[PDB]
Design a protein around this ligand. Structure first.
Ligand SMILES: CC(=O)N[C@@H]1[C@@H](O)[C@H](O)[C@@H](CO)O[C@H]1O
Ligand SMILES: CC(=O)N[C@@H]1[C@@H](O)[C@H](O)[C@@H](CO)O[C@H]1O
Ligand SMILES: CC(=O)N[C@@H]1[C@@H](O)[C@H](O)[C@@H](CO)O[C@H]1O
Ligand SMILES: CC(=O)N[C@@H]1[C@@H](O)[C@H](O)[C@@H](CO)O[C@H]1O
Ligand SMILES: CC(=O)N[C@@H]1[C@@H](O)[C@H](O)[C@@H](CO)O[C@H]1O
Ligand SMILES: CC(=O)N[C@@H]1[C@@H](O)[C@H](O)[C@@H](CO)O[C@H]1O
Ligand SMILES: CC(=O)N[C@@H]1[C@@H](O)[C@H](O)[C@@H](CO)O[C@H]1O
Ligand SMILES: CC(=O)N[C@@H]1[C@@H](O)[C@H](O)[C@@H](CO)O[C@H]1O
Ligand SMILES: CC(=O)N[C@@H]1[C@@H](O)[C@H](O)[C@@H](CO)O[C@H]1O
Ligand SMILES: CC(=O)N[C@@H]1[C@@H](O)[C@H](O)[C@@H](CO)O[C@H]1O
Ligand SMILES: CCCCCCCCCC
Ligand SMILES: CCCCCCCCCC
Ligand SMILES: CCCCCCCCCC
Ligand SMILES: CCCCCCCCCC
Ligand SMILES: CCCCCCCCCC
Ligand SMILES: CCCCCCCC
Ligand SMILES: CCCCCCCC
Ligand SMILES: CCCCCCCC
Ligand SMILES: CCCCCCCC
Ligand SMILES: CCCCCCCC
Ligand SMILES: CCCCCCCC
Ligand SMILES: CCCCCCCC
Ligand SMILES: CCCCCCCC
Ligand SMILES: CCCCCCCC
Ligand SMILES: CCCCCCCC
Ligand SMILES: NC[C@@H](O)CC(=O)O
Ligand SMILES: NC[C@@H](O)CC(=O)O
Ligand SMILES: NC[C@@H](O)CC(=O)O
Ligand SMILES: NC[C@@H](O)CC(=O)O
Ligand SMILES: NC[C@@H](O)CC(=O)O
Ligand SMILES: CCCCCC
Ligand SMILES: CCCCCC
Ligand SMILES: CCCCCC
Ligand SMILES: CCCCCC
Ligand SMILES: CCCCCC
Ligand SMILES: CCCCCC
Ligand SMILES: CCCCCC
Ligand SMILES: CCCCCC
Ligand SMILES: CCCCCC
Ligand SMILES: CCCCCC
Ligand SMILES: [Cl-]
Ligand SMILES: [Cl-]
Lengths: 329, 329, 329, 329, 329
């Protein structure tokens, strides 16, 4: 039906003349995973192309579109899109190549394929884990400059659809939209580039329950010492030491999961402030013990330091929490 | 025998006319693995197709079906099924492609292949680990709409068989069955979709023995303090502190295995209630020590608080367990 | 030499007539790994096929066998064996495909290839780690029923050889042998199936030294308490608590390595019995302390409980060990 | 257009005569990851080739360059570059091969491709983590010696461009530049080799906060003992022991992450010196207890050892830190 | 130039007559990694072949060798070497297949390729980590017996070269050399086999510092108890218990890294002897406490046991170390 043997498909339509326009639209099937250690995400989508080539015209009386097997895609000419700044990708091939080709009697062509991509995304963790991130996926032609191929969104802002099933267990997904920009390479020229943009927001419940509550409970345990007879030395000393030693484990367990950045995160501040709060309660009792021994040496109830600590330590911690949650909201 | 050189197999049977019907049936060989962190499962199965094409007719006197090598599959026309919402898949190829082709003298065709698939499954962990999940595998044609191809289960509900060897170490598998539904894509049209459905139920014995028993034993250890002379301060203080510090480790060891969901699970409730039960026994003795020191200061047996705690703490824990196992059964 | 252009190799020898017999023999090169979490093993072997096809006859005066390059395998007809219930496999291809083809002047053919397979194996862990497992590898034709192809072991029981280098660090390997059985699929018919069977036995030394000895040592540490003055409360209390808290870690470290089965293993019994032995020694001293305080209240040496515990606890543990190693031998 | 059927492209241009010159230039897209355990890095780049072949001449009036599909690359002759000392690499192929071919009417050719490489890099950890590393990527022709192919940087030092987005979370990247050298293989001859060089510098903030601070805090905790009444034996003994036991965990947690080198690293020195500082404070109190018991035996305030330790231990640690940070800056 | 269309390259040179000799030589580029858990190593090398075939003769006046593209390798005949007892391998293919072909006017051929291999190696850990291992890589023809192909090292012992960059962070590499042996398969015949042999020696510094020193320090901590007043029960009891409990962690941390062998390693002996040394110091004080209580009961300084332990325990440990390092050197 299609006159495939007649023509040299190594050359584009309009070869030697003005640029060929090619339109694009997209449907996202899933957003698959995200990594902070590697700074990347994975996405699966359907991608579609539109153009006209009169070498693929055929006669009919119905003026309708026809579908063809799919093994003809490797005989005709086809555009050459690639994903910019991507780590890896593939096209699906079970039970056969997931490819579709439809042609109109005047030579208009529709071409579609299903693909999975993993792409680069630079992340900022200064407000972690109360953070927000923004991402994009880039599309461009490899071989043809804007003097030979013209690339655009087919229907404007309506060119992007999203599956209603899309979900991530740790993030809220929002603000899908599309943009365009021109790009330059020194050795080869100017190119059109298409963008798909979106925003992510992290859920905090896991981190409350797994980090912020136990640190608070250790701080509250250290306060119990102020309520115990100053004469019970082998009770008051280990009570403080054990809380110091636990707070160290919590600090280690948090930071072992993240990338080794060169700046402080919002969770680090909270944990290290709680550490100094616990550390100071040990020096307090050391002072009380020394001053009591001096009194014994002079001579040979509740001490004022205990009496004041019972008020001062909790008030200070409450002030710190008010400030912190005013800053990070 | 088969006139393969005579015809253009880029076009379907009945091209330009009414839709071709294609029937399907399936046998599941194994259900291979399941992930909560990734929310997916893996399955291996045999998949079969049935249709008629008169371009593949041949003469004989016996009216019987014949089997052909398998290298002819890439010369003739073949339907184009794909698995919807799937992460990855392949066809087996040792010692050769695991493919079968049988043809009748009137052009009826039987086509079979062996495949492994990994597929998406959304999971709810609010009753974990006493939870039940339901899953499905989706089948659809990539290129042809319901105006060109008609897809149906060959024998109705009898179209699905299951291997007697199928098993999972952590789940009971039940309720295999098949359904159909129509699907719409904005840019390309209407399609028939086939479903395979099943249900999973988790075994709880591992979690009893590995989580619920040790937390109970820590709670029962904290009660021993009420039976010890109030004068033995360096004994009664560490006995409580060490149980608090162990309960924290159990809490951490559980949640380090699961996805970071934004809601509380049924096991979290039990562990955090046990934590507060243990935490309170430390404040109890702090109160007894303070009140004894006040009595000493005034002046200068078993305390009522101990006497009452010996009854109140165990009764409250038993009430809590009755309620909990009434709710989660 | 071979008349390859003359014939249609899409059709088997004797197409349209009685079944073709095909003989098989095997040499195992290595048994590569085993997984309890995944319930599978990996094997590498050489696999050989024997049949006659008169379309491959050629003239000679010597009546001897000749070897051919190997690129002819994709032109002639070849049998279609696959491994049943397998997870994955491949054929080796460095520096070229590891394939061999030899032909006799009357058309007798010998065909060989090297392959690696990973296969399913259901395992029972009720006597773990003193357990024994049995495994098998299954071989069958994909497309041809017993009416068209007949599959058998070439030399009877002599058809299976094993490399003298085969070894596993954790198991003793024994009892290699071969069997045959007929198989039925509802939609497609009856098939011949060949089996390779073997047995595995686990070495226990690692588990003695890494699990059973330290649990025993914790139990023996708990007994030291009975030998210490009942007046040293802050010594006798932590001595018991610390052993409870260590035994919990041993229990956790064992079960974190295995699949989450729904039944008790032989190592679980030992560890949980040792746990209760240690748990009881804490209640013992609690009783002694309470009864001493009652005597003080009445009034205002070694206690009989200590005196009896010094005999009763070790005797009971020794009785338990005699029974256990009588049952699991 | 191009006379591809006319010529034998198994032979290079100028076959049997002087060497063909081939020029190269490069743009780096990303530096992807680095491993100390494996001693390697990963890089993604665009690579370009320039040469003339008169068998690819064609007539035109415009004297301009033309772009061709890309399926012609496997028909014509093309240079054979490989990456020396590399572990693995691939060329990107979605949605098609990422390859470009441009030709001028006189037969000048431009050839480009996108690739990812993982390459060997020998590392020195004697000043870890205050260390600096230098790396390079090597390029060479596989089959042709300098008598048949001549390989050079196209534009001198201007032949290397770098993407402005390039970043690593743990390193500062600096000093990109290019060099050339001749290489010899005994069996096959002399070859031209091109180099791409760069330098890396590690950020230290993570290691301060995660290793050096907690070790210092343990040392400062051990000093508190000198301020406590020498009569409180069950307080002063555990205070020292627990710090020894914590310092061991820090030492283990650091070295579990790195390769098992045969020499001491700069972080090892700090940690083991802090260990001996803590170890000595236990022997100190042992001495005080023994000497006090001797005084009791003779007979039957603050001891001079405590009085002097309160000054000597901190001064010594401060001297050690001054020296250390003078050496490692 | 080469008459490729004239001949049947499915047949070897001298087909039907005496065996063809094929010579080999090798250059090792890198030794990439080693695993004790899997018992294997990985190697990358260049491999070369030499033979004569008069079907590849061509006329010239210069009598020199010529290089050809590399796409002709799949048209001519080529030998069929494979690596015996190997787990996996591949040939490098970026930017093209890393293959070289050179031919002389009389039909002498040189063939080269670059490859990476992973190979089996049986290891003995009875003297671990002071152990020495020996390894080899095996080379053989798949399809042709010694009656049809003759395989030998081209230049004798000079056939093996090694890159000066080769290094491993944990081993000293020594004693590279080559051997030959004949091999028999029951079903198929006799074959020539080539060997590459080498030796490895482990560096011990990591294990000194990470295992042997801390165990010694725990033993020395247990001795401090003998220097403390026998009346300080809550000090002397935990001092011993905590060292027992730490030594258990060291024992576990070592053996969690290695394969689960059925025999004792040299490091196990040291650690378990140190364990009993620490265990005995607890029974010592238990005895002293009991005997003191008996003296109190009779009645109603330093004990001889302490006095003797202060000499006996260290002397015994020093004797043990002398013997151990005399045996394992
Ligand atoms: C759906 C559609 O666009 N149909 C048109 C039809 O209305 C028109 O009469 C014909 C003329 O060729 O072209 C086609
Ligand atoms: C967020 C975004 O890119 N929105 C685009 C925007 O460029 C434009 O303003 C709008 C028309 O009003 O169409 C849409
Ligand atoms: C198994 C089967 O269906 N056999 C039928 C046979 O009964 C019938 O006589 C024949 C007529 O062509 O067609 C075939
Ligand atoms: C569970 C399920 O899908 N069962 C199907 C159902 O649709 C139908 O009701 C039944 C006929 O009674 O056939 C079967
Ligand atoms: C090894 C073997 O079987 N050789 C036989 C030979 O003994 C016999 O004389 C000949 C007749 O064609 O066939 C061949
Ligand atoms: C273990 C096993 O399968 N052995 C087979 C068996 O079937 C048969 O009894 C024997 C002949 O005596 O040949 C062999
Ligand atoms: C951009 C460029 O180099 N253009 C030149 C043009 O200036 C010159 O007149 C012509 C002669 O053939 O060759 C071409
Ligand atoms: C760092 C480096 O390689 N720089 C090169 C160098 O070889 C040369 O000195 C310079 C010219 O001044 O060109 C550039
Ligand atoms: C390098 C070498 O071997 N060159 C020889 C040359 O000496 C000899 O004169 C010629 C005769 O054909 O063969 C060639
Ligand atoms: C270690 C080794 O294999 N060395 C070989 C050896 O077989 C032989 O003794 C020597 C000649 O003296 O050549 C070399
Ligand atoms: C880490 C040094 C701690 C010193 C404590 C001094 C207390 C003095 C009380 C007057
Ligand atoms: C965490 C603060 C604990 C305060 C305990 C107060 C006890 C008062 C007893 C009357
Ligand atoms: C967990 C509850 C423990 C109760 C101990 C009671 C001892 C009574 C001795 C007569
Ligand atoms: C590890 C041996 C410790 C010995 C301490 C001796 C102290 C003597 C004080 C005079
Ligand atoms: C594990 C049993 C320990 C028994 C200690 C007995 C000491 C007796 C001293 C005479
Ligand atoms: C102690 C944790 C407090 C968490 C407050 C969160 C406010 C949104
Ligand atoms: C940008 C630094 C914020 C630090 C705030 C500290 C709140 C107590
Ligand atoms: C302490 C755990 C109790 C578990 C009860 C389970 C009831 C089915
Ligand atoms: C849906 C919340 C259930 C909480 C029940 C608490 C049982 C003590
Ligand atoms: C305490 C462990 C005893 C192990 C006995 C094993 C008997 C074969
Ligand atoms: C099948 C259960 C065996 C339990 C034996 C217990 C031995 C003390
Ligand atoms: C206690 C850590 C001190 C770190 C000093 C770093 C100086 C650049
Ligand atoms: C090259 C060894 C440096 C050691 C310096 C020690 C500083 C206290
Ligand atoms: C305490 C460890 C001693 C190590 C001695 C090593 C002798 C080569
Ligand atoms: C082969 C056993 C060696 C054991 C030596 C023990 C040294 C104290
Ligand atoms: N469109 C991408 C190309 O320009 C990359 C390159 O070859 O420089
Ligand atoms: N049947 C799936 C296709 O419609 C996907 C698409 O190209 O939109
Ligand atoms: N021999 C295996 C086949 O029968 C599988 C199937 O297609 O049912
Ligand atoms: N240019 C690399 C080649 O020389 C490798 C080899 O075959 O020796
Ligand atoms: N040279 C290896 C072959 O003999 C393997 C086999 O087919 O037996
Ligand atoms: C940005 C610095 C914050 C530090 C608070 C301790
Ligand atoms: C004390 C916690 C209050 C924080 C409110 C955001
Ligand atoms: C759904 C909330 C339950 C919380 C019980 C503490
Ligand atoms: C106290 C446990 C009983 C729960 C019964 C389901
Ligand atoms: C099979 C049950 C055994 C349980 C022993 C405690
Ligand atoms: C007490 C251990 C003896 C067990 C013998 C099998
Ligand atoms: C290079 C040796 C340094 C050791 C310092 C303790
Ligand atoms: C005591 C820390 C000072 C180090 C300055 C580099
Ligand atoms: C080979 C046995 C050695 C055991 C030493 C305790
Ligand atoms: C006490 C350690 C000496 C060992 C010498 C090899
Ligand atoms: Cl005490
Ligand atoms: Cl204590």
């Amino acid at each position: 039906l299609l006159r495939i043997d007649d023509h040299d498909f190594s050359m584009r339509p309009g070869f030697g003349g003005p640029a060929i326009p090619v339109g694009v639209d997209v449907q996202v099937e899933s957003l698959d995973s995200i990594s902070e250690v590697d700074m990347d995400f994975t996405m699966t989508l359907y991608l579609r192309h539109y153009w006209k080539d009169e070498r693929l015209s055929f006669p009919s009386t119905n003026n309708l579109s026809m579908t063809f097997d799919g093994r003809l895609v490797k005989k005709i000419w086809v555009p050459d899109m690639f994903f910019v700044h991507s780590k890896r990708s593939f096209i699906h091939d079970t039970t056969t190549d997931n490819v579709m080709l439809r042609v109109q009697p005047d030579g208009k062509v529709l071409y579609s394929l299903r693909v999975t991509v993993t792409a680069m995304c630079n992340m900022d963790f200064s407000r972690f884990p109360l953070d927000t991130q923004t991402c994009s996926l880039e599309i461009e032609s490899y071989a043809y400059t804007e003097d030979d191929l013209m690339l655009y969104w087919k229907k404007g802002n309506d060119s992007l659809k999203t599956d209603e099933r899309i979900s991530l267990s740790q993030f809220l997904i929002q603000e899908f939209h599309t943009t365009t920009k021109l790009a330059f390479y020194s050795s080869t020229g100017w190119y059109n580039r298409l963008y798909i943009n979106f925003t992510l927001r992290r859920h905090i419940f896991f981190f409350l329950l797994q980090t912020y509550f136990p640190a608070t409970l250790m701080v509250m345990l250290s306060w119990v010492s102020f309520w115990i007879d100053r004469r019970a030395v082998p009770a008051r000393v280990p009570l403080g030491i054990t809380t110091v030693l636990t707070m160290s484990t919590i600090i280690t367990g948090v930071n072992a999961s993240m990338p080794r950045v060169s700046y402080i995160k919002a969770v680090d501040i909270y944990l290290w402030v709680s550490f100094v709060f616990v550390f100071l309660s040990v020096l307090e009792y050391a002072a009380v013990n020394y001053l009591t021994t001096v009194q014994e040496r002079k001579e040979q109830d509740t001490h004022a330091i205990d009496k004041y600590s019972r008020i001062i330590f909790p008030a200070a911690y409450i002030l710190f929490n008010l400030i912190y949650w005013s800053i990070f909201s």
